[PDB]
């Protein structure tokens, strides 16, 4: 409940984490009673000996999807798209009779029917991408099962912006980042910010995300710990956004579209009821579970955002591990960015500890 007690909690938790996990650098933000608190440890660049700072850019990985979803939300609020619109209405070259009956909703929530996790790295232009989606054969009926995938929500992000007349990067920059004043959040890191761009570390070597089709939509975002705290404050309490389309899209990103056990699938965001049991999110965060194919029960109409929720997303790249969580009712939140990927269960357990102490 003080500036120093928060520090003590966060340190007691993070110091052993970095120690036993071999994390060169971490940056962590804690929103407590609406105010943000920031913490840094370690190096962003070992060779050049650069310390981690509140300006250091980390690769977010899958967390980028939360920016995808909200943008989609925004595009919904603008009247440009409806989640009930068929996928083929925005990419009419997808003529396969298996795509008949797949709507933007299903792409957004990984319920298309088993769309593959990753776009094959050999799919390097949008022609190969069209062929790839054309020859995909569904495992299930739309709406029957949830299979977490980059291809699905990536295509959702790519198609949601089509009516905008802008590219995904451009539309995001204009309709999300700039209105919310995230001047340290990038799909493409400009060369003059490259000293703040931490290096990820995979078995000792320094790495950055490799470009891929739809990388911006699924896993290509990089940001500082302050920009991420602002992102969490905006999604946690969006009443202070002047842009009503964005206000609304943020609300829709946390709408509850499907029920998977005790988890509710938003647009990118993933929600559980607060209070909750750690084991749920901890065990579920494991890549063996979070990537599984799980039966989904439709929620129609989608339940509006629930304030008594634990809203979160994990995301990792070759050399980075990142986790975001917040409880709107409690006005509480945590951002964790590390230039080294470590098991999502450990990440979530640490975040849970910290936030449980601070409630």
């Amino acid at each position, epitope marked *: 409940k003080t500036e120093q007690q928060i520090a003590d909690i966060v340190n007691r938790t993070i110091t052993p984490l970095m120690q036993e996990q071999a994390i060169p650098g971490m940056a962590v933000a804690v929103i407590y009673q609406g105010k943000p608190y920031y913490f840094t440890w370690g190096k962003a660049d070992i060779a050049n000996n650069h310390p981690v700072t509140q300006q250091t850019l980390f690769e977010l990985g899958s967390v980028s999807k939360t920016f995808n979803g909200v943008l989609g939300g925004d595009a919904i609020a603008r009247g440009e798209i409806k989640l009930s619109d068929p996928v083929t209405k925005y990419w009419p070259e997808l003529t396969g009779k298996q795509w008949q009956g797949i709507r933007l909703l299903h792409l957004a929530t990984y319920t298309a029917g*088993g769309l*593959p*996790l*990753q776009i*094959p*790295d050999d799919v390097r232009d949008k022609a190969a991408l069209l062929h790839f989606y054309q020859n995909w054969q569904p*495992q*299930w009926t739309p709406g029957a099962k949830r*299979l977490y995938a980059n291809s699905s929500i990536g295509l959702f992000g790519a198609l949601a912006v089509k009516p905008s007349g802008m590219s995904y990067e451009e539309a995001m920059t204009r309709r999300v980042l700039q209105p919310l004043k995230l001047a340290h959040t990038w799909i493409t890191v400009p060369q003059n910010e490259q000293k703040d761009y931490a290096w990820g570390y995979r078995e000792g070597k320094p790495v950055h995300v490799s470009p891929g089709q739809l990388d911006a939509e699924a896993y290509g975002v990089k940001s500082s710990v302050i920009d991420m705290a602002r992102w969490v404050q905006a999604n946690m309490d969006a009443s202070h956004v002047q842009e009503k389309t964005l206000q609304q899209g943020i609300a829709l990103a946390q709408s509850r579209y499907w029920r998977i*056990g005790d988890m509710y699938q938003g647009l990118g965001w993933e929600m559980l009821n607060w209070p909750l049991k750690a084991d749920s999110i901890i*065990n579920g965060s*494991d*890549s*063996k*579970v979070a*990537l*599984a*194919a799980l039966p989904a029960v439709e929620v129609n109409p989608p339940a509006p955002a629930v304030k008594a929720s634990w809203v979160h997303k994990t995301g990792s790249t070759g050399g980075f591990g990142s986790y975001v969580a917040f409880v709107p009712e409690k006005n509480l939140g945590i951002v964790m960015l590390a230039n080294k*990927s470590y*098991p999502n*269960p*450990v990440r979530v357990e640490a975040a849970w500890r910290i936030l449980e102490k601070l409630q």
Partner: nanobody
Amino acid sequence: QVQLVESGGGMVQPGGSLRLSCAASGFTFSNYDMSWVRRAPGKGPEWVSTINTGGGSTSYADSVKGRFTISRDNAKNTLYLQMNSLKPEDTALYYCTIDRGLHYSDLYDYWGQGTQVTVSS
């Protein structure tokens, strides 16, 4: 933490038998459908079999239908795969995992260490 620990692999002559075990820990094993997947030398992954939560549903790939029998013991949190009338075509590394369906390409920190099965003269 969610660990799956394969075992039962070994070297055998064609026609023999071999029971693979997969001991799970760190999660509610009885809540999830479990799959056996295999990876051949040089070749990519390949789905072998799947078994639903209650164990009343089983599903096999054409290559092994009729010869294998997947099962589970949710009391002792253990998946099993009985393999009968093996062929040199079944020589590969075997993993258990939570069911994703059929496709298992482009996989991250994920696979356990599996256990190898080898069938030849």
